[PDB]
Amino acid sequence: DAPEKNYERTMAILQIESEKAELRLKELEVRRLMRAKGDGPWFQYPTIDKALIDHSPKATPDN
Amino acid sequence: GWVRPDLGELSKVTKVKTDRPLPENPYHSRARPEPNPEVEGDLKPARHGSRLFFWTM
Numbered sequence: 001d002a003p004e005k006n007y008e009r010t011m012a013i014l015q016i017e018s019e020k021a022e023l024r025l026k027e028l029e030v031r032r033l034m035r036a037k038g039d040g041p042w043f044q045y046p047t048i049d050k051a052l053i054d055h056s057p058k059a060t061p062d063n
Numbered sequence: 064g065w066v067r068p069d070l071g072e073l074s075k076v077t078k079v080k081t082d083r084p085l086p087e088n089p090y091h092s093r094a095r096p097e098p099n100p101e102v103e104g105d106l107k108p109a110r111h112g113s114r115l116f117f118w119t120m
């Protein structure tokens with residue numbers, strides 16, 4: 001191969017791998033923040049559905 | 064002149080005209096927490112694949 005070909009192919013390799021490494025670091029930071037705060041879509045552990053609640057007038061009023 | 068109610072009448076659900084206001088918060092509840100932000104936007108492919116150590120897809 002030409003030195004030009006090896007050179008610019010190396011530059012394409014380095015761009016792809018440095019982008020993947022920066023995305024992995026951001027992935028770790030996103031996971032840490034979402035586990036710590038619970039405000040993203042990950043680590044959304046379930047709670048009770050409020051659509052199960054009966055809101056009808058019951059037998060006794062103090063409720 | 065009072066007429067005794069028939070079978071079924073005293074168990075009816077009646078309507079009541081009042082002058083007191085309807086309670087806006089009968090449970091004395093505070094404000095609910097704001098929900099988590101939803102998903103929006105188109106779903107793009109994963110940038111350079113799985114990014115699992117050496118797999119290019």
Ligand SMILES: CCCCCCCCCCCCCCCCCC(=O)OC[C@H](COP(=O)([O-])OC[C@H](O)COP(=O)([O-])OC[C@H](COC(=O)CCCCCCCCCCCCCCCCC)OC(=O)CCCCCCCCCCCCCCCCC)OC(=O)CCCCCCCCCCCCCCCCC
Nearest residue numbers: 009012013016017020111112113114115116117118119120
């Ligand atoms: C117009 C419409 C139609 C268009 C058609 C266009 C195509 C026309 C040709 C049609 C045929 C296409 C075939 C698939 C494309 C080439 C795939 C390829 O070589 O990937 C290179 C892949 C990465 O190299 P690359 O230079 O970065 O990529 C070049 C391409 O861009 C590769 O592209 P990529 O980067 O996008 O690839 C994605 C990713 C690229 O890979 C990666 O990102 C790296 C991770 C790969 C897996 C590493 C696992 C490590 C631990 C396990 C080690 C395995 C043990 C070794 C084998 C044991 C004995 C079988 O692949 C994978 O992750 C898939 C896993 C590997 C399977 C590859 C395909 C195998 C098909 C036949 C299987 C036969 C057995 C093969 C050996 C079994 C093990 C592979 O090479 C390796 O990982 C080396 C291992 C060997 C790969 C298999 C070679 C396929 C041809 C075998 C023929 C001879 C068989 C002899 C008999 C059986 C064995 C005894």
